Symmetry: C2
Subunit: 284 residues, 2 copies
């Protein structure tokens, strides 16, 4: 509140403050205004606008080493969830992908429970500008390699930390070597495959409210994410691997005659995935 | 040649012709010039520039139904080939993708010849703005369906008509029901499979110079193309088609017992593929 007051006072233009107070002009707003905008709010004299613009230039550009522009302008960031309408084709296609990828697992519903299909409560698009910029920059880097192709896919992700993911993004620092391909972040083509990890590894102890892994009452959350796989390394046997193998950007576990029953995808960099859709559902 | 003269004479500005002759200004160039550009070439009077600009507006905007702009802007279109440097990362990535995807087929190199590695002579980027905009518009159309996911792959294509493809683009009107999945354009993830079709189905009659399908001497050509698959219908046995099945944008033929040996992809609309790279090579 007092920052713009100091800024204007240093210029000797405090007599303009009664305008800035009425238009709710803060310093983060002032740093984005030129001659046109300043004339709109009532700064009529050219000299006053010139002084204000030169002060803004001296602050933002003259002291860029301090990044004053980033201590300002912080507001407006964050995650917005936009609810899809069941009558739209986007919701219907997401639900079709969710339902049609269910499969019979080797374990008798021990981790994910027993069901044939889902009841989808709502689907939301996740919008976060900083996370999206991180993802697109990494995608550009990966596609500069691998002959101008990002090998981008849309894959399911199940975790008890979905809320943290949709606000801070994917992070490989939360992965550990206990995984089947090591310390990477895992994704699957099958929604039922990801449903096993919603309550932790191996299903954990079930829902917090029933302690039941097949609880048909408590809600569940999955993510449907854009994953940049780049040049993927195909593997059929388990590895305790910390990073992608040399020359590759991801690992693909393939279902052979023995071992894996379904395809699996692993990325060792959090910036290579973006959680586009958040799906809330129950198992039938 | 003469159109600029008629345009200038109709405005009563024929005395300006000597300038337009010196500066090689044609009508297609004139329609793109404003006050700044006209002032640059020495048309100093405001009235003359005003008359020229309003005449251009009356022509291009006043007769939009006859599309004079399309007639004037024909020049500059067409394909160009940009040679890749063997020392560049892109060339090496394409070469590795081609070499590492060689497989031994069910036949003993009857269609594509007998070999284990390629001798890549050159790789060329194909640039054509019209075809690129067509492909990008189709990609946006498909992405609006299939929950904001194009499902874009990089795949190999081989045919005796690549020269027509790089200038006119992929065209489904040349496809016929004789294919195993009907009248579509076929792509493969394995270079050696696409190599089988360079001279025609089953290798045709071999290279023109020798009529030899396993010729090690004559140059062969393949395309490495962006293919938009969207929602792909999985298939394991042959069934003929004129178009993709309802709700789907492409067909994926999968390996199976008594079925295919290697994966195949089929599209039924030409604008869903773009021939990004042209590769020419020798069979070793
Ligand atoms: Zn419960
Ligand atoms: Zn030959």
């Amino acid at each position: 509140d007092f920052s713009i007051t100091q800024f204007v006072r240093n210029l000797g233009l405090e007599h303009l403050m009664d305008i800035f107070e009425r238009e709710q002009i803060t310093l983060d707003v002032l740093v984005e205004m030129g001659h046109k905008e300043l004339k709109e709010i009532g700064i009529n004299a050219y000299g006053h606008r010139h002084k204000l613009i030169k002060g803004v230039e001296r602050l933002i550009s003259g002291q860029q080493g301090l990044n004053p522009y980033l201590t300002l302008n912080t507001s407006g960031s964050g995650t917005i969830l936009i609810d899809l309408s069941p009558d739209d084709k986007e919701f219907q296609s997401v639900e079709e992908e969710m339902q049609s990828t269910v499969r019979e697992h080797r374990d008798g519903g021990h981790a994910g429970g027993i069901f044939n299909r889902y009841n989808i409560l709502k689907i939301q698009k996740v919008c976060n500008k900083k996370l999206w910029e991180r993802y697109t920059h990494r995608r550009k880097e990966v596609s500069e390699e691998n002959h101008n192709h990002a090998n981008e896919r849309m894959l399911f992700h199940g975790s008890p930390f979905v809320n943290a993911i949709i606000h801070k993004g994917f992070d490989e620092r939360h992965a550990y070597i206990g995984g089947m391909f090591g310390a990477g972040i895992y994704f699957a083509e099958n929604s039922s495959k990801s449903n096993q990890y919603v309550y932790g590894i191996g299903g954990g102890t079930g829902c917090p409210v029933h302690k039941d892994r097949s609880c048909y009452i408590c809600h569940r959350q999955l993510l449907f994410c854009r994953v940049t796989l780049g040049k993927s390394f195909l593997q059929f046997s388990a590895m305790k691997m910390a990073h992608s193998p040399p020359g590759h950007h991801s690992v693909t576990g393939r279902p052979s005659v023995n071992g894996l029953a379904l395809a699996e995808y692993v990325i060792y960099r959090g910036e290579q995935a973006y959680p586009e859709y958040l799906i809330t559902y129950q198992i039938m």
